[PDB]
Design a protein around this ligand. Sequence first.
Ligand SMILES: Nc1ncnc2c1ncn2[C@@H]1O[C@H](COP(=O)(O)OP(=O)(O)CP(=O)(O)O)[C@@H](O)[C@H]1O
Ligand SMILES: Nc1ncnc2c1ncn2[C@@H]1O[C@H](COP(=O)(O)OP(=O)(O)CP(=O)(O)O)[C@@H](O)[C@H]1O
Ligand SMILES: Nc1ncnc2c1ncn2[C@@H]1O[C@H](COP(=O)(O)OP(=O)(O)CP(=O)(O)O)[C@@H](O)[C@H]1O
Ligand SMILES: O=c1ccn([C@@H]2O[C@H](COP(=O)(O)OP(=O)(O)OP(=O)(O)O)[C@@H](O)[C@H]2O)c(=O)[nH]1
Ligand SMILES: O=c1ccn([C@@H]2O[C@H](COP(=O)(O)OP(=O)(O)OP(=O)(O)O)[C@@H](O)[C@H]2O)c(=O)[nH]1
Ligand SMILES: O=c1ccn([C@@H]2O[C@H](COP(=O)(O)OP(=O)(O)OP(=O)(O)O)[C@@H](O)[C@H]2O)c(=O)[nH]1
Ligand SMILES: NC(=O)CC[C@H](N)C(=O)O
Ligand SMILES: NC(=O)CC[C@H](N)C(=O)O
Ligand SMILES: NC(=O)CC[C@H](N)C(=O)O
Lengths: 556, 556, 556
Amino acid sequence: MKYILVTGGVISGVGKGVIASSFGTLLKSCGLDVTSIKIDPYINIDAGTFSPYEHGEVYVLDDGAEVDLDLGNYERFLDVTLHRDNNITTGKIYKLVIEKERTGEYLGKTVQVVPHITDAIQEWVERVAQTPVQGSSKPQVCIVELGGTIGDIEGMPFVEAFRQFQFRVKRENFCLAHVSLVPLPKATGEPKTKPTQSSVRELRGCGLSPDLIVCRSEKPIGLEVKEKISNFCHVGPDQVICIHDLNSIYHVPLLMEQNGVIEYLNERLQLNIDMSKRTKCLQQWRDLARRTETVRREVCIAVVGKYTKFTDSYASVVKALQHAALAVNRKLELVFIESCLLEEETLHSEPSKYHKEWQKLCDSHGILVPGGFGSRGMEGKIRACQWARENQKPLLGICLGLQAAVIEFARNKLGLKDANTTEIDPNTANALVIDMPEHHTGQLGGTMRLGKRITVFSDGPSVIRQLYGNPKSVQERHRHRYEVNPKYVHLLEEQGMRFVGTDVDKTRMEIIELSGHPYFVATQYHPEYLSRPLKPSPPFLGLILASVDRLNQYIQ
Amino acid sequence: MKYILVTGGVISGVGKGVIASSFGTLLKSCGLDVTSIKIDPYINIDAGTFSPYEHGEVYVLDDGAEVDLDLGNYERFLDVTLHRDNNITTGKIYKLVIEKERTGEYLGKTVQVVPHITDAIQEWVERVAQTPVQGSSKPQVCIVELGGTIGDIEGMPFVEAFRQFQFRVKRENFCLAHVSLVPLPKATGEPKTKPTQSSVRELRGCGLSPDLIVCRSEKPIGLEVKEKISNFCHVGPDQVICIHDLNSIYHVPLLMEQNGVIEYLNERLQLNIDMSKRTKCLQQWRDLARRTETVRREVCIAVVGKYTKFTDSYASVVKALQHAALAVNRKLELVFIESCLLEEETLHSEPSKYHKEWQKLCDSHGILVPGGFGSRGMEGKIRACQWARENQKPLLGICLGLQAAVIEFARNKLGLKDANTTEIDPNTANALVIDMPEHHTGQLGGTMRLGKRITVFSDGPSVIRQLYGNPKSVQERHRHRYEVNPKYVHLLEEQGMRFVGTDVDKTRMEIIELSGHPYFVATQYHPEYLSRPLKPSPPFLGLILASVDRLNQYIQ
Amino acid sequence: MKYILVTGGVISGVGKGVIASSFGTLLKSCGLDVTSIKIDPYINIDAGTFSPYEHGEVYVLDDGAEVDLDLGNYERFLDVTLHRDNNITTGKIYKLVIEKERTGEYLGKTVQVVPHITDAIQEWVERVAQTPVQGSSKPQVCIVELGGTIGDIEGMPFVEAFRQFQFRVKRENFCLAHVSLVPLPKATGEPKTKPTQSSVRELRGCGLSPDLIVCRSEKPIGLEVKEKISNFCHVGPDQVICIHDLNSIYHVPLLMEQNGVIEYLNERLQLNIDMSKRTKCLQQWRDLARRTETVRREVCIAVVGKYTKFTDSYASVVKALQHAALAVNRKLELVFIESCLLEEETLHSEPSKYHKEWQKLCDSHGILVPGGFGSRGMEGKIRACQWARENQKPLLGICLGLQAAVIEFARNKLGLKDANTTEIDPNTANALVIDMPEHHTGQLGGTMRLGKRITVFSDGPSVIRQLYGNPKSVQERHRHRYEVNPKYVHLLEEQGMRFVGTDVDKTRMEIIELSGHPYFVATQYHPEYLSRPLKPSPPFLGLILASVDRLNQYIQ
Ligand SMILES: Nc1ncnc2c1ncn2[C@@H]1O[C@H](COP(=O)(O)OP(=O)(O)CP(=O)(O)O)[C@@H](O)[C@H]1O
Ligand SMILES: Nc1ncnc2c1ncn2[C@@H]1O[C@H](COP(=O)(O)OP(=O)(O)CP(=O)(O)O)[C@@H](O)[C@H]1O
Ligand SMILES: Nc1ncnc2c1ncn2[C@@H]1O[C@H](COP(=O)(O)OP(=O)(O)CP(=O)(O)O)[C@@H](O)[C@H]1O
Ligand SMILES: O=c1ccn([C@@H]2O[C@H](COP(=O)(O)OP(=O)(O)OP(=O)(O)O)[C@@H](O)[C@H]2O)c(=O)[nH]1
Ligand SMILES: O=c1ccn([C@@H]2O[C@H](COP(=O)(O)OP(=O)(O)OP(=O)(O)O)[C@@H](O)[C@H]2O)c(=O)[nH]1
Ligand SMILES: O=c1ccn([C@@H]2O[C@H](COP(=O)(O)OP(=O)(O)OP(=O)(O)O)[C@@H](O)[C@H]2O)c(=O)[nH]1
Ligand SMILES: NC(=O)CC[C@H](N)C(=O)O
Ligand SMILES: NC(=O)CC[C@H](N)C(=O)O
Ligand SMILES: NC(=O)CC[C@H](N)C(=O)O
């Protein structure tokens, strides 16, 4: 196997994820089978106990693992289905080693960071890079992305491990790409290279020497800075890639190919890539990158969320909307409406903000009510669901907009002003949402309905089933404990509601619809985790279509 | 509280243990209440899975913990009874933090080395330095000893933690002593200071600056090197302590007091030590250090062990023998006889070594058969027990020489040539030694009879009970699974054997004796873990006495 | 060209000089043409302003330069005649660069350490390694020896320069050998490898990775430590050379050849060394190393010097005596008599030391009065010259024992009790030694008679001319200002004195002799700088011969 470690320099948040995914899609278009690994140096087995403000929209994999979002970038660019062992952390490693020790598999000897922790890291990487990730095909390249910045005390074990790995795997089977920042202050008005110099120096002071140096700047830099970097880093003048701020991220693979990275790698790792046939493989990505510039229609969508102060806490949602729009040939424009500012409590505090946010919500072509955990800001979601039900405005809810929509329907058509979940107020008289742990009721192994599960379609013509291709069932990724109450099923179904999707046991409804409303679908699963750039999720696709008044035409 | 971190420099194995214990005994003679902590940067909860070749004679504490031997130095110098939390490791810390994370006590946030691991280390140190360790008195000084060498990747978390600790605890309550090596090669014939320079530079490059620099050399160095160190380390000329290779280790506290370390600390940590009364407190240690030079009697003892290639795998045993000798006013001389070279299998290989070792064993005044685990080299222990029983030679066995002695008695007085343990050969017909797990039979919590337990004395005049002060019972530290068979009790007691000590349940014999033999005591417990310099263990004391033919006189 | 940088580790004074000279003589026996370079990181153009206590017996080259003594090791092992540019210092480099700047050869640009100082160092090394040093043959290998220890602030420019040099010269033309110390303390009784680990880590943290690791210890270390070093340094198990303390230094090249360093280098630098013919080239060195063990005759020589507290301040003298002895097949034994302890001023202070030193001087077979500068301890030299003239004891004086001998002859045969030099007391009435600057009288360029000059032989049968091969003249290296007075020439020649050697101008006498004395030669030049192991200097040879009463036989 051949490995490509990707490291970071001046700051964290400079683009290693897209760089790595681009290497991956390049190598995958040239006929290879790539896999990927993300190394988070934080002491956390997984991202289940995380808040979106911390690390941006916890992802979910098919086996039920909750991981970083960079694995989402990998899955969306390479079109693969990773596993849990593709997300290494310091906690996983130390816990594995400590268990091994207490058991007695290090019999009699002293366990130290070097060599035992680093051997664990190496064995992990080697074992994981051989797990068939796109069926049964065995990988040939593995892209490791070392989160953080080179120099921190958190990621020294890993740097040492890879310092030994390059000797262990015959450097002709190992490359290292360093992503650094070239700041261009507004005072000096000149790009500065000293940060990159210090970062490369710190790196080489750890036993590693870069082969590529991808310099991330806001605006393009000239050959002067390129040759300065080449000199002060002993890299050539053609293996210093310059990646400025592009329109979209489908430009990055192209900006890398045009800079001769495919040829460099084919010559450096000895991959045996037939050049004459590696033409016209990125055609799909060129088309997609052109459609990113050749769309002027201005479809506007409303994201009624509670973390809207961050734009990374909805990464997969935003990106699925973008994919669907690009497939509909429209220019998406997203307004981030905070659900806290739709309640009357802010009307008593800042009527200005209240009316401004409600105006935003009212002059939009569609409404998306994402998921979330807790209680802060759910009443606003219910207000928005109601307003979109009383104004014939399309709406899509995801695992919490479904609960909110059902609550709205209850408290506004059954008059049950006490309708609520068992989460916001447990001692409520009427409870439309109650816990249904998958199997935690009985054991501790399996509390939350995590991972990919089956959902069959109840009989009845439904637009959501038509969008999905009129199948019998779908596999989708779930992350939720609660569920719609099975007793109020008829109390709310003898009305403008319809449950078209459920599990094989018919006790869990996870796809609802409204009668007469043009588009009021809501799902208990997360359809955004299976939305690839060349494959938009049917729900978001229908949302966009109905939001521009083209859905019925698209069906017929 | 006031803390004294002790760090190491050029190499590991330069004397930090004795330096720290000496600081402790100095401060404890001046009227203070000291506690101690040892920081082993290895990934091991404890030293239960260790072999003596690794880290030198696993110690045992009253609560059942198996720790390093440096805690033995602390206990023997300060006369305290430490606990399990007085031995910090990287594994303990990381495991605690990982459990906290998985539970949810770091709610929502990202756990990193800094600040979380270092905060755990700080809280651990602060909580532990306040645990009454000599009764109910609360400590006032805590001596932390950071194992390893400053610069290694294993102990960076701890160095960072203490870099923050010195600010957290108001540097007037914090000192740092650096122990370094001054090599004197035989080519240059001149002491070299460059290693110490590099070590102090690496240290200061971590945020810490030494207050004392204890330079360990083989021979005394002059004022030239002292002032060179003072210059190149920005320490004064009086806070550079020079500690050469002394006769014994009871000289180190004196060589430190004479160098004005007590005054320096009293002025630096502001301890309020009344100088006029701090005279004639180390009188006991001066007497002991003089008795180390004024003894010429040449009592020779045989240590029939299996790890005799190392002199640190019997540290506590050797030191208890030294204490007892010094109390008897004799100059101990130890011969380390490997038990493997007493079997006939080496007679068929190297008769020279066989006869040499047997000669050594035969021209000695006494025999000590220490403990150990496994099977390699036990037959030799049985041969030695027999020879000492058939030649009226004193013998003392410790938790494995007792089993070996019982096996010898069986197979040489009952003719049961098949007598053996259930460990060497489980399917044996006759088994004199069988497992009796304390409570593992029933659960997993408590398999080995670890820690301090009670042993009552069965009726009958016994020399071992006379040595112990004629008490009803004794508290001693046990570490063993096996036990003498309760069915062969009479098969071997209707002979020259006598079981004078047992537990409160009378099902476990742990003190035996021979009838007619001058001294053939053997104990299932470890009496060397309670042998302090000013308090020798009664068993070793009686061994030495009988070995010089003075025991009967000492009793009467 | 192919370069071999030699670096040092734990301490300075571990043996890089002999290591490098051994590499040189190995490569030179295999048919190559080696040159050498010494990099002293001190700010000193040369060693003219130095005292022997500082850096051990300032050397002198043919062109008049005063350099370190390591160039003496190079000259004595490779049999070459180096130049001034073969001794790089920080001062030379910075001065060259500053002159270039002030002139304007760096026109308009900013001069910095990197890249300008390092480019100066590289250009210097490349230019110097191509200067024919053994005639007109152009070198093929250049051995650079970087004085100091890797890590110090003095030698970072050079380490950076060579980090760039390995890329500039195509690593197949560059090797780096790291000499480190493996301390074996007497407490632990075990070799420690952690210093070497830290040194290799610091090195790799500067951009360089060792190819060989020569470990210098006092006693041989086993394969365990070798493999530990190989592991913790990523070098093989055969490129870790172990060099213990040998009898002599003619063993080092052999101990290196036997360890397969010649083959390693031939394979690593691609030198094209014909193995089948590289046998029986070190035969001379094997013979010399055997003669170092097979000599038992105990010739004793007296070194009447003033720096005798150091054994490196007479390196060349001691080594020339050793060469001559080995050629005479005798075991040299050197007694270092301090000339200060022969004056009556110590008789009034410590008669014990006075009589002890005079006894030492009296029970020796010969006397050597070396050179030196100043006044402290010259009266003792005159006392010794007299005693050796009045007791028929051989004597050899070198550029200061000649002045002392002439002073003795004057004040003890002419009664001129005021005889003295113009240096000890300038206003003296009688002055036997006066300044005769070569050409400083007239200019500032050439004050001291430095460098190699001609000395012709005045007519008359002389034993010193017979030893030199009965030539007409000799080329020898001078370093001195003063000279014998040309007016007292006859005042002291109409007596037991004879001036057999002088310059072409017949105004400077530099070879004297006594009439009737068996051997009382004294030279104003330094004959020890041309004494190679296989070519002993005639003066020392005759001294040894006459000291064993074999000189007349050797002549006839
Ligand atoms: N060259 C580029 N041009 C335009 N947009 C870019 C870009 N590189 C990154 N981006 C955008 O900024 C975001 C930066 O996040 P990214 O994950 O790529 O870097 P990162 O440093 O946060 C990875 P990690 O968190 O593991 O350190 C990307 O998601 C992308 O939307
Ligand atoms: N100044 C001294 N003089 C004489 N003997 C000394 C000595 N210092 C230490 N020793 C002896 O050498 C042994 C060195 O072991 P010690 O535990 O003191 O250092 P160390 O570096 O091994 C602690 P750690 O293992 O935690 O790093 C001591 O047990 C002692 O018997
Ligand atoms: N392996 C060896 N065996 C025996 N003697 C040795 C030896 N290596 C060195 N020596 C002796 O010790 C002396 C050490 O001086 P040397 O010049 O070789 O090291 P060094 O570190 O002082 C060079 P520099 O001053 O440039 O750093 C040598 O001159 C030699 O006489
Ligand atoms: O104020 C200064 C700045 C710099 N210098 C010295 O002149 C040199 C200028 O180097 P700089 O630090 O100004 O920039 P750089 O060329 O290393 O890379 P960029 O940040 O421009 O991308 C440096 O080597 C420094 O030693 C000064 O003497 N004074
Ligand atoms: O061979 C050498 C050795 C040393 N030096 C230079 O002269 C200085 C001598 O310093 P040293 O390295 O010889 O020793 P030290 O005084 O630092 O401490 P000790 O090991 O003696 O205890 C150093 O600063 C070095 O730069 C040389 O130029 N050449
Ligand atoms: O007192 C100690 C000493 C060492 N250690 C830990 O156990 C390991 C022992 O490693 P050492 O530091 O004792 O020696 P070494 O094997 O690195 O090389 P030598 O000096 O023996 O030649 C080290 O990695 C350290 O983390 C401790 O925990 N406590
Ligand atoms: N992902 C979410 O929005 C979670 C919503 C809610 N906690 C549930 O389990 O249904
Ligand atoms: N400490 C020891 O010598 C152990 C001996 C034996 N394993 C027992 O448990 O009795
Ligand atoms: N090298 C020396 O001994 C110098 C001696 C004296 N200074 C001279 O010039 O003659």
